[PDB]
């Protein structure tokens, strides 16, 4: 299985024959396509489980959970597909799942139905970080959907921030050419040459994009259908683009981002190709 | 244009070269694949316009609007494609359209014309213009009002569809509900089960038909709620209850269960085919 092969090539721990990632290995696995396995896979010990407890115990509960965990944590393979589906699938399906797994419409599940959720997503021994975080140190607890959904949103925020620092190349701001590089990342070579013909010559360096403006673009990405039809209503210029994004997403967008995407896609915007490139990610 | 072909041979009025339906011609156009044009197309006169106004004045604003209108009203071609996509496309696009058209959560007549042009490519005053923008074309249409109009029209079409398959009566035997479900649809084995293991027991009420009809709109959520089982009647009823939010009468579930040999993918293949 290709997914499990990848999970294994990013796994640092092993026990009884089933490999485990660390939070650092998970972040590495979403952020880098490959990495040099310079060290063998050490086997799991009891200092590592106690480290799993301590890390949760001293980590932030928000957008810095996984980074604050560092190497103190464990993630099984099913939990890794689970987290992958948080980052790549819409959240309403999870609300449907919670409403089909809960007892007496309480919208709260215990640890066993969390196991069965990962079995269902999987086919489609020890206690891990997610079990200790959602449920008890000892399974004392049950996971309400509100808690779990703000966990999903926090993890998405985390991955967004680390993507920003990756394309900022460590610094606090992101030049508009690095935003253009990030937008056209999954585009093939031909179209990238056509767009880089535009950026190459008429995208200037002015302001540099903040993390919050990147996050604003990221919230605009989630309302692409409404925006797509609001565009199909149109001849489309910057005032009309800004209005269309403002009513299709509710979000005011920073002049740097609009300038960048307008000068990539050309005094009229080529929104057919713009949204074709967007929906590929 | 083939859609214009249909609109034209269902049209009863004409003017200046532009053909117009009455509300009855529209309903007939949604309910019957064909009809014999027995009468010629008449020229539009002023008694028809004042009849449109009066018909609007003495009609219900809810689920009986078009049937209460009868022949006293007119519907342009652009308005006919407009109403057709109201019945076959989701409604959120209309909300984004409204907020792309307003200066206030409200649209004027000019922007309604714009909307019928955009929906079209996707002189006289008609029924919809007088209803939304008044006799005088100077009113404004709030999105809530118009969404009430869409839901009321869908209710209307549901009621007339029920009366079509109930064949005039107040209740619908399970066999005619199966007739409606399998209309556009392996087809023999479905008809083998309704014939021998469907007990023409209770009859399906109109409200339970409407419940199934609104369940049809949450088919994706239901698909995931079904993929959670990885089979029985309580589990199917729970899945419909959380996928649509809404309790369903045991009568319909019995019918759909014995039609489809209680593997839900095939059932939803038949459903999403309409």
Coordinates of N, CA and C in Angstrom, one line a residue, chain A residues 14-138:
Chain A
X14 N 9.0 1.9 16.3 CA 8.5 0.6 16.0 C 8.3 -0.2 17.3
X15 N 7.3 -1.0 17.3 CA 7.0 -1.9 18.4 C 6.1 -3.0 18.1
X16 N 6.6 -4.2 18.2 CA 5.9 -5.4 18.0 C 5.6 -5.5 16.5
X17 N 6.3 -4.8 15.7 CA 6.1 -4.8 14.3 C 5.2 -3.8 13.6
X18 N 4.6 -2.9 14.4 CA 3.8 -1.8 13.8 C 4.5 -0.5 14.1
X19 N 4.8 0.2 13.1 CA 5.6 1.5 13.1 C 4.7 2.6 13.6
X20 N 5.4 3.6 14.2 CA 4.7 4.8 14.8 C 5.5 6.0 14.3
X21 N 4.8 7.1 14.0 CA 5.3 8.4 13.8 C 5.3 9.2 15.1
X22 N 6.2 10.1 15.2 CA 6.3 11.2 16.1 C 5.5 12.4 15.5
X23 N 5.1 13.4 16.4 CA 4.5 14.6 15.8 C 5.5 15.3 14.8
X24 N 6.8 15.2 15.1 CA 7.7 15.8 14.2 C 7.8 15.0 12.9
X25 N 7.7 13.7 13.0 CA 7.7 12.9 11.7 C 6.4 13.1 10.9
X26 N 5.3 13.4 11.6 CA 4.0 13.7 10.9 C 4.2 15.1 10.2
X27 N 4.6 16.1 10.9 CA 4.8 17.4 10.2 C 5.8 17.3 9.1
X28 N 6.9 16.6 9.3 CA 7.8 16.3 8.2 C 7.1 15.6 7.0
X29 N 6.2 14.7 7.3 CA 5.5 14.0 6.2 C 4.5 14.8 5.5
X30 N 3.9 15.8 6.1 CA 3.0 16.6 5.3 C 3.8 17.8 4.6
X31 N 4.9 18.2 5.2 CA 5.6 19.3 4.7 C 6.7 19.0 3.7
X32 N 7.3 17.8 3.7 CA 8.3 17.4 2.8 C 7.9 16.1 2.0
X33 N 8.1 16.1 0.7 CA 7.7 14.9 0.0 C 8.6 13.7 0.2
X34 N 9.9 14.0 0.4 CA 10.9 12.9 0.8 C 11.9 13.6 1.7
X35 N 12.6 12.7 2.5 CA 13.7 13.1 3.3 C 14.7 12.0 3.5
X36 N 15.9 12.2 3.8 CA 16.9 11.2 3.9 C 16.7 10.5 5.3
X37 N 16.3 9.2 5.2 CA 16.3 8.3 6.4 C 17.7 8.1 6.9
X38 N 18.3 9.0 7.6 CA 19.7 8.9 8.1 C 19.9 7.9 9.2
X39 N 18.8 7.7 10.0 CA 18.9 6.9 11.2 C 17.9 5.7 11.1
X40 N 18.3 4.6 11.6 CA 17.4 3.4 11.7 C 16.2 3.7 12.5
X41 N 15.2 2.8 12.5 CA 14.0 2.9 13.3 C 14.3 2.2 14.7
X42 N 14.4 3.0 15.7 CA 14.5 2.5 17.0 C 13.2 2.0 17.6
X43 N 13.3 1.0 18.4 CA 12.1 0.4 19.0 C 11.5 1.2 20.2
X44 N 10.2 1.1 20.4 CA 9.6 1.9 21.4 C 9.9 1.4 22.8
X45 N 10.1 2.3 23.7 CA 10.4 2.1 25.1 C 9.4 2.8 26.0
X46 N 9.5 2.5 27.3 CA 8.6 3.1 28.3 C 8.9 4.6 28.6
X47 N 10.2 5.0 28.4 CA 10.5 6.4 28.5 C 9.8 7.2 27.3
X48 N 9.5 6.5 26.2 CA 8.8 7.2 25.1 C 7.3 7.3 25.4
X49 N 6.7 6.3 26.0 CA 5.3 6.5 26.4 C 5.2 7.6 27.5
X50 N 6.0 7.6 28.5 CA 6.0 8.6 29.5 C 6.2 10.0 28.8
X51 N 7.1 10.0 27.8 CA 7.3 11.3 27.1 C 6.0 11.7 26.3
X52 N 5.3 10.7 25.8 CA 4.0 11.0 25.2 C 3.1 11.7 26.2
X53 N 3.1 11.2 27.4 CA 2.2 11.9 28.4 C 2.7 13.3 28.7
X54 N 4.0 13.4 29.0 CA 4.5 14.8 29.4 C 4.3 15.8 28.3
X55 N 4.6 15.4 27.0 CA 4.4 16.4 25.9 C 3.0 16.9 25.8
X56 N 2.0 16.1 25.8 CA 0.6 16.5 25.8 C 0.5 17.4 27.1
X57 N 1.2 17.0 28.1 CA 0.9 17.7 29.4 C 1.4 19.1 29.4
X58 N 2.4 19.4 28.6 CA 3.1 20.7 28.5 C 3.1 21.4 27.1
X59 N 2.1 21.1 26.3 CA 2.0 21.6 25.0 C 0.8 22.6 24.9
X60 N 0.8 23.5 23.9 CA -0.3 24.3 23.6 C -1.4 23.6 23.0
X61 N -2.7 23.9 23.3 CA -3.9 23.3 22.9 C -4.4 23.9 21.6
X62 N -3.7 24.8 20.9 CA -4.2 25.5 19.8 C -3.4 25.2 18.5
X63 N -3.0 26.2 17.8 CA -2.4 26.1 16.5 C -0.9 25.6 16.6
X64 N -0.4 25.5 17.8 CA 1.0 25.1 18.0 C 1.1 23.7 18.7
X65 N 0.0 22.9 18.7 CA 0.0 21.7 19.4 C 1.1 20.7 19.0
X66 N 1.2 20.4 17.6 CA 2.1 19.5 17.1 C 3.6 20.0 17.2
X67 N 3.8 21.2 16.9 CA 5.1 21.8 17.0 C 5.6 21.8 18.5
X68 N 4.7 22.2 19.4 CA 5.1 22.2 20.8 C 5.3 20.7 21.3
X69 N 4.7 19.7 20.7 CA 4.9 18.4 21.1 C 6.4 17.9 20.7
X70 N 6.9 18.3 19.6 CA 8.2 18.0 19.1 C 8.3 16.5 18.9
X71 N 9.2 15.8 19.7 CA 9.4 14.4 19.6 C 8.6 13.6 20.7
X72 N 7.8 14.3 21.5 CA 7.1 13.6 22.6 C 5.7 13.3 22.2
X73 N 5.5 12.2 21.6 CA 4.2 11.8 21.1 C 4.2 10.6 20.2
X74 N 3.1 10.0 20.0 CA 3.0 8.8 19.1 C 1.7 9.0 18.2
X75 N 1.8 8.4 17.0 CA 0.7 8.5 16.0 C 0.8 7.2 15.3
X76 N -0.3 6.3 15.4 CA -0.3 5.1 14.7 C -0.7 5.4 13.2
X77 N -0.7 4.3 12.4 CA -0.9 4.5 11.0 C -2.4 4.9 10.7
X78 N -3.3 4.3 11.3 CA -4.7 4.7 11.2 C -4.9 6.1 11.6
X79 N -4.3 6.6 12.7 CA -4.4 7.9 13.1 C -3.7 8.9 12.1
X80 N -2.7 8.4 11.4 CA -2.1 9.2 10.4 C -2.9 9.4 9.2
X81 N -3.6 8.3 8.7 CA -4.6 8.5 7.7 C -5.8 9.4 8.2
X82 N -6.2 9.3 9.4 CA -7.2 10.1 10.0 C -6.8 11.6 9.9
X83 N -5.6 11.9 10.4 CA -5.1 13.3 10.3 C -4.9 13.8 8.9
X84 N -4.6 12.9 8.0 CA -4.5 13.2 6.5 C -5.9 13.6 6.0
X85 N -6.9 12.9 6.5 CA -8.3 13.2 6.0 C -8.8 14.5 6.6
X86 N -8.4 14.8 7.8 CA -8.7 16.1 8.4 C -8.2 17.2 7.5
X87 N -7.0 17.1 6.9 CA -6.3 18.1 6.1 C -6.7 18.1 4.7
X88 N -7.4 17.1 4.2 CA -7.7 17.0 2.8 C -9.2 16.7 2.4
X89 N -10.1 16.6 3.4 CA -11.5 16.4 3.2 C -12.3 17.5 3.9
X90 N -13.5 17.9 3.4 CA -14.3 18.8 4.2 C -14.8 18.2 5.5
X91 N -15.3 19.1 6.4 CA -15.5 18.7 7.7 C -16.9 18.2 8.0
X92 N -17.9 18.5 7.1 CA -19.3 18.1 7.3 C -19.4 16.5 7.4
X93 N -18.6 15.8 6.6 CA -18.6 14.4 6.7 C -18.2 13.9 8.1
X94 N -17.3 14.6 8.8 CA -17.0 14.3 10.2 C -18.2 14.5 11.1
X95 N -19.0 15.5 10.8 CA -20.2 15.8 11.6 C -21.2 14.7 11.4
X96 N -21.3 14.2 10.2 CA -22.2 13.1 9.9 C -21.7 11.9 10.6
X97 N -20.4 11.6 10.6 CA -19.8 10.5 11.3 C -20.1 10.6 12.8
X98 N -19.9 11.8 13.4 CA -20.1 12.0 14.8 C -21.6 11.7 15.2
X99 N -22.5 12.2 14.3 CA -23.9 12.0 14.6 C -24.3 10.5 14.3
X100 N -23.5 9.7 13.6 CA -23.9 8.3 13.5 C -23.2 7.4 14.5
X101 N -22.1 8.0 15.2 CA -21.4 7.2 16.2 C -21.8 7.5 17.6
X102 N -22.5 8.6 17.8 CA -22.9 9.0 19.2 C -24.2 8.3 19.7
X103 N -24.3 8.3 21.0 CA -25.4 7.7 21.7 C -26.3 8.7 22.3
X104 N -27.6 8.7 22.0 CA -28.6 9.6 22.5 C -28.4 11.1 22.0
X105 N -28.0 11.2 20.7 CA -27.8 12.5 20.1 C -27.0 13.5 20.9
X106 N -26.1 13.0 21.7 CA -25.3 13.9 22.5 C -24.1 14.5 21.7
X107 N -23.8 14.1 20.5 CA -22.8 14.6 19.7 C -21.4 14.4 20.4
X108 N -21.3 13.3 21.1 CA -20.1 13.0 21.8 C -19.8 11.5 21.7
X109 N -18.5 11.1 21.5 CA -18.2 9.7 21.2 C -17.1 9.3 22.2
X110 N -17.0 8.0 22.5 CA -16.0 7.5 23.3 C -14.9 6.9 22.5
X111 N -13.8 6.4 23.1 CA -12.6 6.0 22.4 C -12.9 4.9 21.4
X112 N -13.8 4.0 21.7 CA -14.0 2.8 20.8 C -14.5 3.3 19.5
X113 N -15.5 4.2 19.5 CA -16.0 4.6 18.2 C -15.0 5.5 17.4
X114 N -14.0 6.1 18.1 CA -12.9 6.8 17.4 C -12.1 5.7 16.7
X115 N -11.8 4.6 17.4 CA -11.2 3.5 16.7 C -11.9 3.0 15.5
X116 N -13.2 2.9 15.6 CA -14.0 2.4 14.5 C -14.1 3.5 13.4
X117 N -14.0 4.8 13.7 CA -13.9 5.8 12.7 C -12.6 5.6 11.9
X118 N -11.5 5.3 12.6 CA -10.3 5.1 11.8 C -10.2 3.8 11.1
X119 N -11.0 2.8 11.5 CA -11.1 1.6 10.7 C -11.9 1.9 9.4
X120 N -12.9 2.7 9.5 CA -13.8 2.9 8.4 C -13.0 3.8 7.4
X121 N -12.3 4.9 7.9 CA -11.5 5.6 7.0 C -10.3 4.8 6.5
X122 N -9.8 3.9 7.3 CA -8.7 3.1 6.9 C -9.0 2.2 5.7
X123 N -10.1 1.4 5.8 CA -10.4 0.5 4.7 C -10.9 1.2 3.5
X124 N -11.5 2.4 3.6 CA -11.9 3.3 2.5 C -10.7 3.8 1.8
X125 N -3.2 -1.6 21.5 CA -2.0 -2.1 22.2 C -1.5 -1.0 23.2
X126 N -1.1 0.1 22.6 CA -0.7 1.3 23.4 C -1.6 2.4 23.1
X127 N -1.5 3.5 24.0 CA -2.4 4.6 23.9 C -1.6 5.8 23.3
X128 N -2.1 6.4 22.2 CA -1.4 7.3 21.4 C -1.6 8.8 21.9
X129 N -1.0 9.7 21.2 CA -1.2 11.1 21.5 C -2.7 11.5 21.3
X130 N -3.3 11.1 20.2 CA -4.7 11.5 19.9 C -5.7 10.9 21.0
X131 N -5.4 9.7 21.4 CA -6.3 9.1 22.4 C -6.1 9.8 23.8
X132 N -4.9 10.2 24.1 CA -4.7 11.0 25.4 C -5.3 12.4 25.3
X133 N -5.3 12.9 24.1 CA -5.7 14.3 23.9 C -7.2 14.5 23.8
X134 N -7.8 13.6 23.0 CA -9.3 13.7 22.9 C -9.9 13.0 24.1
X135 N -9.5 11.8 24.5 CA -10.0 11.1 25.6 C -9.1 11.2 26.8
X136 N -9.3 10.4 27.9 CA -8.6 10.6 29.1 C -7.1 10.2 29.1
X137 N -6.3 10.7 30.0 CA -5.0 10.1 30.3 C -5.2 8.6 30.3
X138 N -6.3 8.2 30.8 CA -6.8 6.8 30.9 C -8.1 6.5 30.2

